[PDB]
């Protein structure tokens, strides 16, 4: 085998390290980002739950990297940690330098470059983490992206990474309508998350949620994390609980 | 084997098989022929095309290192960009330092110094190139003091002066022909048709100016890389000569 | 054996040891008889330097080297490797003389040398030494002789011996303690060294030897290191010749 390092290729010119790093994302739970006309909703899944586990101090797969762009996380979390910080620091470096907030495409481009750079040179490991970037910039309004652990990005109107990628993708696109209401965006997220997930009863503590809107509080990109007691309500509207 | 996985590791023969192997890279690249005369050295080459869409008039394999020092090459061109780069710098830094023409021989050594570099470090020549060079040069020029000289700079070994040398793919059959057809009585015009005559023999292609390129070092004419018409004219004379015979 | 242990020199075996350091010692076995004879008013060094053929020049190559002007050293094993440890000793010795304005104590030298050897077992981009080094001199607190193993072990020695014929050499030293319970004068311990090395040459009998003897003695060399040569050395030769026959 030729999986000894990033430098070395197989006969066919593929690199196994990239391949393993894709597979790493799908051994941690489903993550779904939906863009809609009236907001972009992010929703993610808890791969951990113990009866004495707490998860009310923090979301372990959602970080705001700037006051206008936030990311949902899929992969190993230690690997995740390093990069979340690198991105958020780079964001504010842009803010310091230009006195305005970072455009989405630059932010994604920076992290895929860093991730590729670890493949291109040295001994350092590639870091298999897939971020779903949901942002607003005046270039293309709402923008939903994801980053590959292969170290490039693609724009989206919906994407799912994490566990059950095939399952999440067809289900989301079947009930996609070009428009989409932000309430329906929420309703859809919960429905696809139940089916994918092997915990029969999808409760609010198995859910992370944020909705991102400039259609609420106009002239201002406002990202808002839902609290448990709000998540608890919407489950009763979708009839899970 | 096992002695081609270390560059500081010798064979039970006392040799380096990493280096040995780089000789076969030199041989892999297409044939180059140089022939020194008492009037100038004529440097001819082979090129290859697979499509006519290849611009054959805007590719390099005879390169100008100075206006009186020229070179041919054979082997990997990835390695050659770097090799030719170093050697340009030396000629220029000599005129920087001195206001006088570099020596052909002296240039030959400097090139081989960059060739020596296989790893990192080493005193009196800090090594920055990480693998064996896969490129050789036929180095032809003129300093007054030693007239017109032809060397073959060998990254594996060190430099050997030649009075005529063929490298590349067609080297073994050429060398024998070049024994029987290097003289101390060669003229520059005759040398020109000689080079083409030897090239054709070992070229399994068609002789044309599109895959050939003559050039001379004549110290009174400067380094002149030839035109397509000019070389075409030499292809034409060659054919009338050998038709009569 | 394999699996580390003898392939790397910082990796330990289940035996709690390293087999490469045993191999470092084995190269000492292969090296030639060197003794140091501690005395109560000096120290004496003798060495057997074999003669390979008679084209060699007489008394012009040694293994006796000096540090400062009062510390003699001689190494057995691998010759060019043994030079470099003494050379490294000099650089260390020089630093002591700079900072403290005084010659080095022989127990100070023994500590610094043993750190240098021990370092070459902590890294794996390094090779160990493969030499023992008998050394010592006279200082403040008198004469001291130490001997350093390629192991990085040392202890004080009333007699030190290394090289191939050291079995004979160690027995003769112990006889020397018994016959003279002060270890004899430094003048006669030179002669005593010659009788040892000649018997040690019954283990090396196939070729010829050259006896080089040096000393450093409290009042017989006036606290300085010098080579033992001329009528002193001629004496040693003669005493030694007499006493084998």
């Amino acid at each position: 085998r030729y999986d000894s390092r990033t430098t070395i290729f197989s006969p066919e010119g593929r690199l196994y390290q990239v391949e393993y790093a894709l597979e790493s994302i799908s051994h941690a739970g489903t993550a779904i980002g939906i863009m809609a006309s009236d907001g972009i909703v992010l929703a993610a899944e808890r791969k951990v739950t113990s009866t004495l586990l707490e998860q009310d101090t923090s979301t372990e797969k959602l970080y705001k990297l700037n006051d206008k762009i936030a990311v949902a996380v899929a992969g190993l979390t230690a690997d995740a940690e390093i990069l979340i910080n690198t991105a958020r620091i780079h964001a504010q470096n842009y803010l310091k330098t230009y006195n305005e907030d970072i455009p989405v495409e630059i932010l994604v481009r920076r992290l895929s470059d860093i991730k590729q750079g670890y493949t291109q040179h040295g001994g350092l490991r590639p870091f298999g983490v897939s971020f779903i970037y949901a942002g607003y910039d005046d270039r293309y309004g709402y923008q939903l992206y994801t980053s590959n652990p292969s170290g490039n990005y693609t724009g989206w109107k919906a994407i799912s990474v994490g566990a059950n990628t095939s399952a999440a993708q067809t289900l989301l696109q079947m009930d996609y309508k070009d428009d989409m209401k932000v309430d329906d965006a929420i309703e859809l997220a919960l429905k696809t998350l139940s089916k994918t997930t092997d915990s029969s009863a999808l409760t609010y503590d198995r859910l992370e949620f944020a909705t991102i809107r400039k259609g609420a509080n106009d002239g201002e990109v406002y990202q808002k994390i839902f609290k448990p007691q709000e998540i608890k309500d919407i489950l009763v509207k979708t009839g899970i609980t | 084997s096992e002695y081609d996985r270390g560059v500081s590791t010798f064979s039970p023969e006392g040799r380096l098989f990493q280096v040995e192997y780089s000789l076969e890279a030199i041989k892999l690249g297409s044939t180059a022929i140089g022939i020194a005369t008492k009037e100038g050295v004529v440097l001819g080459v082979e090129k290859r095309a697979t499509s006519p869409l290849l611009e054959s008039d805007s590719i390099e394999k005879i390169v100008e290192i100075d206006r009186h020092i020229g070179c041919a090459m054979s082997g990997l061109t990835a390695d050659a960009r770097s090799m030719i780069e170093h050697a340009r710098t030396a000629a220029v830094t000599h005129n920087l330092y001195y206001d006088e023409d570099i020596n052909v021989e002296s240039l030959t050594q400097s090139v081989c110094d960059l060739a020596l570099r296989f790893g990192e470090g080493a005193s009196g020549e800090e090594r920055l190139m990480s693998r064996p060079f896969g490129v050789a040069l036929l180095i032809a020029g003129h300093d007054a003091d030693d007239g017109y000289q032809l060397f073959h700079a060998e990254p594996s070994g060190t430099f050997y002066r030649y009075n005529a040398k063929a490298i590349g793919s067609g080297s073994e059959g050429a060398q024998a022909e070049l024994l029987n057809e290097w003289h101390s009585s060669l003229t520059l015009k005759e040398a020109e048709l000689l080079v083409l005559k030897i090239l054709k023999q070992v070229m399994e292609e068609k002789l044309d100016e599109n895959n050939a390129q003559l050039s001379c070092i004549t110290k009174q004419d400067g380094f002149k890389i030839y035109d397509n018409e000019k070389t075409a004219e030499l292809i034409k004379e060659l054919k009338e000569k050998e038709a009569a015979e | 054996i394999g699996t580390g242990y003898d392939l790397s020199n910082s990796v330990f075996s289940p035996d709690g040891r390293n087999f490469q350091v045993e191999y470092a010692v084995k190269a000492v076995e292969n090296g030639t008889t060197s003794i140091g004879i501690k005395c109560n008013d000096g120290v004496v060094f003798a060495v057997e330097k074999l003669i390979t053929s008679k084209l060699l020049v007489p008394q012009k190559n040694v293994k006796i080297q000096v540090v400062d002007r009062h510390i003699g050293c001689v190494y057995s094993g691998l010759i060019p490797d043994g030079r470099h440890l003494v050379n490294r000793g000099r650089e260390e010795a020089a630093s002591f003389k700079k900072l403290y304005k005084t010659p080095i104590p022989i127990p100070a030298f023994a500590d610094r040398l043993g750190q240098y050897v021990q370092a070459h077992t902590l890294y794996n981009s390094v090779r160990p030494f493969g030499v023992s080094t008998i050394f010592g001199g006279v200082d403040k607190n008198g004469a001291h002789l130490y001997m350093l193993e390629p192991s990085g072990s040392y202890w004080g020695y009333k007699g030190a011996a290394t090289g191939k014929g050291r079995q004979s050499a160690k027995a003769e030293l112990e006889k020397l303690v018994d016959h003279h319970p002060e270890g004899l004068s430094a003048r006669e311990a030179v002669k005593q060294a010659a009788k040892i090395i000649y018997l040690a040459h019954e283990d090396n009998k196939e070729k010829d030897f050259e006896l080089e003897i040096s000393w450093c003695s409290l009042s017989e060399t006036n606290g300085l290191h010098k080579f033992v040569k001329g009528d002193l050395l001629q004496e040693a030769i003669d005493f030694a010749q007499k006493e084998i026959n």
Partner: protein
């Protein structure tokens, strides 16, 4: 086994990494460059995967280095990314030093030089990308189309295909194209570039991407509607 480093050679003199890099190009979609008498059209296969995927926010296969140099690529998308920004800066640094618009020769030679530098090194791989660097200059009216290869070797060719199933597309282009007569008009340059691409797309007239570069710093990227008139024009003659 001699395909483990770029400091170990085979008895034939190859570094299989470069050879396996050329197979990597083939993973990335085709790109085709063809020059005319007063233009170069740099045309490429584009991918439309899903309704969710966009085009606005979803990378183009053409990136414009500057206003008088353009660049297409084929290979892995991540590798070309670092190379393009790197290429763009190099292109700027020309003007910074010299104060002149970037030469196309200068650009192909440095950019593959970055590739070359990596290949020369044994401790790091180079890129797995082959590019087309096409352009003009405000001084020179001669149209130029250059190539890079993953070895860090740059070559110049009148017309070339690289990328996915390039070889098959190549043979068709040889025949129609002549060094004695390239396409006279721009529209005709485009028709040939399209005829070549039809082959790789199978069907898909949103999947054929056309860009045109002419001298005096004219770069245009053609509307969807314009690309579509060619496809329909080529089917009536077909």
């Amino acid at each position: 086994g001699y395909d483990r480093a770029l400091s170990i050679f085979s008895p034939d003199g190859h570094i299989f990494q470069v050879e396996y890099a050329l197979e990597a190009v083939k993973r990335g979609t085709c790109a085709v460059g063809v020059k005319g008498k007063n233009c170069v059209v740099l045309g490429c296969e584009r991918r439309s995967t899903l309704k969710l995927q966009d085009t606005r926010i979803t990378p183009s296969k053409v990136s414009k280095i500057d206003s008088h140099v353009v660049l297409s690529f084929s290979g892995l998308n991540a590798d070309s990314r670092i190379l393009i920004e790197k290429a763009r800066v190099e292109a700027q640094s020309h003007r910074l030093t010299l104060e002149d618009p970037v030469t196309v020769e200068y650009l192909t030679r440095y950019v593959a030089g970055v590739q070359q530098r990596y290949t020369q090194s044994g401790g790091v791989r180079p890129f797995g990308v082959s590019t087309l660097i096409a352009g003009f200059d405000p001084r020179d009216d001669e149209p130029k189309l250059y190539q890079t290869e993953p070895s860090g070797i740059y070559s110049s060719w009148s017309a070339q295909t690289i990328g996915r199933n390039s070889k098959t597309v190549r043979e068709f282009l040889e025949k129609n194209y002549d060094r004695k007569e390239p396409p006279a008009t721009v529209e005709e340059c485009v028709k040939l570039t399209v005829r070549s691409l039809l082959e790789v797309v199978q069907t898909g007239a949103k999947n054929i991407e056309i860009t045109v570069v002419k001298p005096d710093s004219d770069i245009v990227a053609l509307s969807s509607e314009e690309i579509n008139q060619y496809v329909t024009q080529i089917e009536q003659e077909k």
